[PDB]
Design a protein around this ligand. Structure first.
Ligand SMILES: *OP(=O)(O)OC[C@H]1O[C@@H](n2cnc3c(N)ncnc32)[C@H](O)[C@@H]1O
Ligand SMILES: [Mg+2]
Length: 639
DNA sequence: GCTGATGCGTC
DNA sequence: GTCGGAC
DNA sequence: GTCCGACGACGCATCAGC
């Protein structure tokens, strides 16, 4: 067969057998994957990306089915099922050390180029071999080497990781090192992620079904259909995969089934079950009540307090075992021994199994009061012993996904909410149903929004009760709406802050500034104090304007009246002059930023939660910026 | 062991 | 988490 | 709307230099 360096999964009339660059039953070469990533990287149309990846996957299914699973994980840049918690434990620092060693270059040269180009991969492949090349990299080989890195732990493990990473680079050719480096830095940058990979996979197994005797008699099913019939058929097949995956987002479970039994029978084998994390329902932001009403204008809906904690998806298995997962399917069971011990107390005796959607919120037992998110994050994370817990939590339950052996994902929220209230028991400061309001009246919603904040919440979640009110993520992942005071114009906490530094952009921001350092004005000491960084809220056009206008203000050394304490040192110091209007959701007590240090806390300054750029204040000099005393005042009225 | 840095998670 | 670009 | 990847604060757990 042809050399993988000429593989072209973007060609017209791609034939899964004739246009593959490996022989049947052979390991998929990693360069075939890298070539597919190149062709994905080169386009902006996502559906073209899907087709290109689909072509590779069709060849994998037709020629080397054992390599489908590693190829898929490589395309997602995942190490495996998220609940198993494999982590590379490799930062850009370590990665740049491996690159500098492999390329025979000095480290600072490598670091400077990586900062300039905003991509470690561009440094790895653009940099006299006394040794003949090692065996070519394979898709399954590379994937297992990533997992080897992830399993290395303990003192001296970074040295062993560098050894593995160097061995990969020495074996790379053409564009492989580019995507090895990008995978290790956690920034594959394809423009193609989970939904595109699902679409490519369902299309692949539909056009080129697995399990065929080789050579496969059916390599492009549905070519003879009308465009509309073909499109409808692929959507239906796509929905089978998506709905299975949202209930069982674990390719270790789905792929063996898919290859052995096929896509049509997949839902019979992979089913939602307690102990298997599933995808949570998400929410779209809204600009105000009017947008909520428009989006739900044909459906009765309920409003619920949006509690400020961490999502906890609680699984009670038949027999008594309890599992708790985060919103990203991480295993949090070892984090909440206290919650596990109180499960028997939240449910009626008749409840044998369930899956609950809850928010875990820090709770002050002496004051009987919700505590801020920053208190909740001080809980320990791994293998916590119940007696050691110092920050108690209260569960605010808002949905019920599974009850007594029966999935409720296809039931309307009216029924799910009714079953939650009927089968579970509230205990103040331990397990409580989310406060809710059923109405369409603007004024009642506005007052309820105001009350939620008074009762220590972020705002409101809005959910339809009967129309399109299911828990089917595959039909719409953002089926709920969120309404926060800081989404409203002319409302929320707005600050005028001084730009004192800029950071070189990465990825989509390469070649300009991707972020900025902002500061408030400390009247008392006559100093500007870093308060937060800022990297969102500007259009691409606005960001070009900033790059041009700020370029003229770059300083070699920091000004003596600018204090940053623990903040990341800017790549470019800027003459303090530009004043920007900046919005945030809350002010936080910061362990690094000096703004307003000593005005609220002896040792801590203040930063901004969810800061975003709004507009330039061309009418403002730096002396007219928000003062540090004003920052302290804003923080204090948060209560 | 001591110290500071930092990867990855939560939002 | 927020946000804007591509479709 | 959907999908994606730029970017934010911040804290536990754990890394290396010494
Ligand atoms: O900001 P966001 O899109 O992540 O908001 C969604 C998150 O909000 C939390 N939350 C708190 N209270 C609720 C209720 N009542 N219903 C749904 N979600 C709620 C969740 O943790 C969710 O991830
Ligand atoms: Mg993880």
């Amino acid at each position: 067969s042809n050399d993988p360096s000429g593989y072209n999964p973007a060609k017209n009339n791609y034939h899964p057998v004739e246009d593959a660059c490996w022989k049947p039953g052979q390991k998929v070469p990693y360069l075939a994957v890298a070539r597919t990533f190149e062709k994905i990287e080169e386009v902006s149309a996502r559906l073209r990306m899907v087709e290109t990846l689909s072509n590779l996957l069709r060849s994998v299914v037709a020629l080397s089915p054992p390599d489908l699973l590693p190829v898929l994980y490589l395309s997602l840049n995942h190490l495996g099922p998220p609940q198993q918690g494999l982590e590379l434990g490799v930062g850009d620092g370590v990665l740049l050390k491996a690159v500098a060693q492999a390329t025979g270059r000095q480290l600072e040269s490598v670091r400077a180029e990586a900062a300039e180009k905003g991509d470690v991969g561009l440094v790895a492949e653009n940099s006299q071999r006394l040794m003949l090349p090692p065996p070519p990299l394979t898709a399954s080989g590379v994937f297992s080497k990533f997992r080897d890195i992830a399993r290395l732990t303990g003192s001296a493990s970074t040295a062993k990781k560098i050894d593995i990473i160097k061995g990969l680079f020495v074996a790379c050719r053409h564009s492989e090192a580019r995507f090895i480096a990008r995978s290790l830095s956690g920034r594959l940058r394809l423009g193609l992620a989970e939904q595109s990979v699902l679409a490519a996979l369902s299309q692949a197994v539909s056009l080129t079904p697995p399990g065929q005797e080789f050579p496969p008699a059916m390599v492009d099913a549905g070519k003879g259909k009308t465009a509309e019939a073909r499109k409808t058929w692929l959507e239906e097949q796509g929905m089978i995969l998506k709905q299975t995956f949202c209930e069982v987002p674990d390719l270790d479970r789905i792929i063996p089934v898919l290859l052995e039994h096929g896509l049509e029978r997949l839902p019979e084998h992979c089913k939602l079950s307690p102990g298997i994390p599933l995808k949570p329902m998400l929410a779209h932001p809204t600009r105000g009540i009017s947008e909520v009403l428009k989006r739900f204008e044909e459906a009765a809906f309920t409003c619920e307090y949006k509690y400020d904690g961490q999502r906890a998806q609680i699984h009670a298995l038949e027999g008594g075992e309890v599992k708790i997962f985060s919103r990203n399917q991480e295993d949090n069971t070892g984090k909440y021994p206290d919650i596990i011990s109180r499960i028997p107390k939240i449910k009626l005796p008749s409840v044998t199994s369930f899956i609950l959607d809850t928010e875990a919120v820090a709770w002050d037992r002496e004051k009987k009061q919700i505590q801020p998110f920053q208190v909740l994050t001080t809980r320990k994370r791994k293998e916590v012993d119940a007696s050691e817990i110092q920050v108690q939590v209260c569960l605010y339950a808002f949905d019920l996904i599974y009850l007594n052996g029966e999935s409720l994902v296809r039931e309307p929220l009216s029924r799910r909410r009714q079953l939650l209230r009927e089968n579970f028991v509230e205990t103040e400061g331990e397990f409580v149903f989310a406060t809710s309001l059923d109405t369409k009246d603007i004024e009642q919603i506005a007052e309820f929004l105001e009350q939620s904040v008074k009762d220590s919440c972020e705002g409101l979640m809005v959910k339809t009760l009967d129309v399109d009110a299911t828990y089917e993520i595959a039909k719409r992942s953002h089926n709920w709406l969120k309404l926060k005071k800081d989404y409203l114009d002319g409302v929320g906490d707005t600050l005028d802050l001084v730009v004192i530094g800029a950071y070189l952009g990465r990825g989509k921001r390469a070649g300009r500034y991707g972020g900025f350092l902002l500061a408030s004005y400390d009247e008392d000491s006559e100093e500007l104090q870093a308060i937060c960084k800022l990297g969102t809220g500007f259009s691409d056009e606005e960001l070009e304007e900033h790059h041009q206008s700020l370029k003229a203000l770059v300083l070699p050394s920091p000004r003596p009246y600018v204090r940053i304490d623990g903040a990341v040192i800017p790549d470019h110091w800027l003459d303090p002059s530009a004043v920007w209007e900046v919005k945030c959701a809350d002010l936080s007590l910061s362990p690094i930023y000096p703004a307003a240090r000593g005005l609220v806390d002896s040792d801590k300054g203040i930063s901004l939660r969810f800061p975003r750029f709004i507009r330039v204040r061309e009418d403002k000099q730096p002396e007219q910026a928000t003062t540090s005393a004003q920052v302290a005042c804003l923080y204090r009225k948060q209560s």
